[PDB]
């Protein structure tokens, strides 16, 4: 009764919202937050695709996606803690000296 198209469009909306939140923010924490939004949107799209076909594979890919999201959130917050404890500044544009 629910269209697959509507669930896919909802996942796409959340994905592009996470992408623009990733781009527009100088603070690294909001960049990590936008990354979490994008990966949650991708997992939602996999759930919609799996539930449309009546298959278990969508929830399995969802489980793999949230395992990835947990590990990436852990690593990114470790890197953010390192940046804050070595520079006392979460500005990502200051971490830019390698260029050319």
């Amino acid at each position: 009764m629910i269209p697959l198209q509507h669930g896919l469009i909802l996942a796409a909306i959340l994905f592009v919202l996470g992408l623009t939140g990733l781009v527009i923010r100088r603070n690294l924490l909001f960049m990590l937050i936008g990354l979490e939004i994008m990966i949650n949107a991708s997992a939602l799209a996999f759930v919609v695709a799996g539930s449309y076909w009546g298959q278990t594979d969508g929830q399995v890919m969802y489980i793999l996606a949230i395992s990835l999201a947990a590990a990436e959130a852990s690593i990114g917050l470790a890197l953010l803690l390192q940046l804050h404890r070595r520079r006392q500044n979460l500005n990502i544009d200051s971490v830019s000296e390698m260029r050319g």
Partner: protein, 54 residues
């Protein structure tokens, strides 16, 4: 009129073009992570539009 080898200079023109193009392309490697994410999204837009056109 032909003491400085004009044909040699005209054949050396592609080296000048290559140096100018490389110097222009190296400006996009500014080191900003936000621009790197922006360029990834721009390339995603270009790839998706090209695939939808064909």
């Amino acid at each position: 009129l032909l003491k400085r080898d004009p044909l040699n200079s005209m054949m050396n023109i592609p080296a000048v073009l290559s140096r100018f193009a490389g110097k222009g392309l190296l400006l996009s490697e500014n080191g900003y992570l936000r621009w790197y994410v922006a360029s990834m999204s721009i390339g995603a837009v270009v790839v998706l539009a090209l695939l939808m056109v064909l």
